Write a protein that binds this ligand. Structure first.
Ligand SMILES: CC(C)[C@@H](OC(=O)[C@@H](NC(=O)CCC[C@H](N)C(=O)O)[C@H](C)S)C(=O)O
Ligand SMILES: [Fe+2]
Length: 329
C-alpha cells in the first residue's frame, strides 16, 4: 500500500553555462518538481561522487573512540563548549546507531571576522590527526567547495523558476560567509539492532529519524544506494527511490517562508533499514545577515505580508527546534 514519489531526474548542466533558454528549460523542471512532491534528482552535476563516498567510508570505518571524544561536539564532551555545530556526533552502542561528522565553511578560521566577533552559528572546524587520516581534511574541504559550486548553480535555477534574475538567491550565497554545512552520516548495519534506535511512526512504519522540514534554503544530498527516505503527501508517505549517481534536492523552510509557501519545504522522514549506508547532506545556508524580501508568486503584484527574516536568526532558531522536536543527533 506504500506508493512511490515522483522524483524527476533533471539534467542541471545548462545552469553552469550560458545558453539562457536551456537554463529556462531547467528552471521549468525545477518549478514543476518544487510544486509537486518537492524533490528532484540533479543529474549531470559534474561532481565525482564515487570519490566522495570512498573517502567518507574510509573515515567512518577507521576513526577510533579516542579520536571521537577528541572531535566531539559539546553534546558528547563538556570540554568542548564552542562546538555546537562542527565536530563528531557519536553513536551510543546499544542505544543510538547513527554517527556523523559535521563541518562548516573552511574560511571560518580564528582570524575570520565573525569568529573574532564570536557571532552565533559560526565555528572553526575541527579535524582529525592528518597522520591517522591522510588526505581526509583536504578531501572534505575540496568537497565543500565542489558542492558549493553545484549549489550555486541550482540556486540560479530556483531563481529563474520563480521569475527572478538568476542571482536572486546566489548573491547571498558566498564563500566568505556562508553558514552552509556538510554532514558525513554513517548509518550502520548492526545485529542485533538496538531497539532504542528505532522509532515507530504514527502509521506503524519503523524509522531512524522522524518527520521534519529541513532548516535550509535548499538541501543538496548524496546518499549511497539504499532506499530509505519518504516524503509526506496528502495521501500519506511515499517512498523516494535511491540513486547513488545523483544529488537529491529539496527546499528548506527558509524557501517556504520567502515564497509564501509556494515552494513548500517538503515534510520527510528516514525509514529504519538495517544496512550499512551513507547520507551526506549539504545544507545550503546563506550569510548571518542575509535577508531576502518575501514575495508571493501567485499574486499579480508579487506582494507578501510576511516579514523579512535574517538568515542567522532563522538558522539559530531552526537548529534548536530540530533538536527539541527530533532529538540530539
Ligand atoms: C536526509 C536527511 C533527512 C538526514 O537528516 C539530517 O541530516 C538532519 N539534519 C540535521 O540534523 C541538521 C544538522 C545541521 C548541522 N549539524 C549544522 O549545524 O548545520 C535533518 C533532520 S535534514 C538523514 O538523517 O539522512
Ligand atoms: Fe531532512
Amino acid at each position: 500500500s506504500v506508493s512511490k514519489a515522483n522524483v524527476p531526474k533533471i539534467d542541471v548542466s545548462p545552469l553552469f553555462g550560458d545558453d539562457q533558454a536551456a537554463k529556462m528549460r531547467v528552471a521549468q523542471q525545477i518549478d514543476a518538481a518544487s510544486r509537486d512532491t518537492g524533490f528532484f534528482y540533479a543529474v549531470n552535476h559534474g561532481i565525482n561522487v564515487q570519490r566522495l563516498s570512498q573517502k567518507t567510508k574510509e573515515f567512518h570505518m577507521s576513526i577510533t573512540p579516542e579520536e571521537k571524544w577528541d572531535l566531539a561536539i559539546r553534546a558528547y564532551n563538556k570540554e568542548h563548549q564552542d562546538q555546537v555545530r562542527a565536530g563528531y556526533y557519536l553513536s551510543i552502542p546499544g542505544k543510538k546507531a547513527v554517527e556523523s561528522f559535521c563541518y562548516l565553511n573552511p574560511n571560518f578560521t580564528p582570524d575570520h571576522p565573525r569568529i573574532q566577533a564570536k557571532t552565533p552559528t559560526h565555528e572553526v572546524n575541527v579535524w582529525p590527526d592528518e597522520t591517522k587520516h591522510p588526505g581526509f581534511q583536504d578531501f572534505a574541504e575540496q568537497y565543500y567547495w565542489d558542492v558549493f559550486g553545484l549549489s550555486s548553480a541550482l540556486l540560479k535555477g530556483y531563481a529563474l523558476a520563480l521569475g527572478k534574475e538568476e542571482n536572486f538567491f546566489a548573491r547571498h550565497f558566498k564563500p566568505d560567509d556562508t553558514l552552509a554545512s556538510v554532514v558525513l552520516i554513517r548509518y550502520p548495519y548492526l545485529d542485533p539492532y538496538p531497539e532504542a534506535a528505532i522509532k515507530t511512526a504514527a502509521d506503524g512504519t519503523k524509522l531512524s529519524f522522524e518527520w521534519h522540514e529541513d532548516v535550509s534554503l535548499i538541501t543538496v544530498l548524496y546518499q549511497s544506494n539504499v532506499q530509505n527516505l519518504q516524503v509526506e503527501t496528502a495521501a500519506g508517505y511515499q517512498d523516494i527511490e535511491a540513486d547513488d549517481t545523483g544529488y537529491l534536492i529539496n527546499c528548506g523552510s527558509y524557501m517556504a517562508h520567502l515564497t509564501n509557501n509556494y515552494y513548500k519545504a517538503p515534510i520527510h522522514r528516514v525509514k529504519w533499514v538495517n544496512a550499512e549506508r551513507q547520507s551526506l547532506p549539504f545544507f545550503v545556508n546563506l550569510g548571518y545577515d542575509s535577508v531576502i524580501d518575501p514575495f508571493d508568486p501567485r499574486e499579480p503584484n508579487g506582494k507578501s505580508d510576511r516579514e523579512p527574516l535574517s538568515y542567522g536568526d532563522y538558522l539559530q532558531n531552526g537548529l534548536v527546534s530540530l533538536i527539541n522536536k527530533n532529538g540530539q543527533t
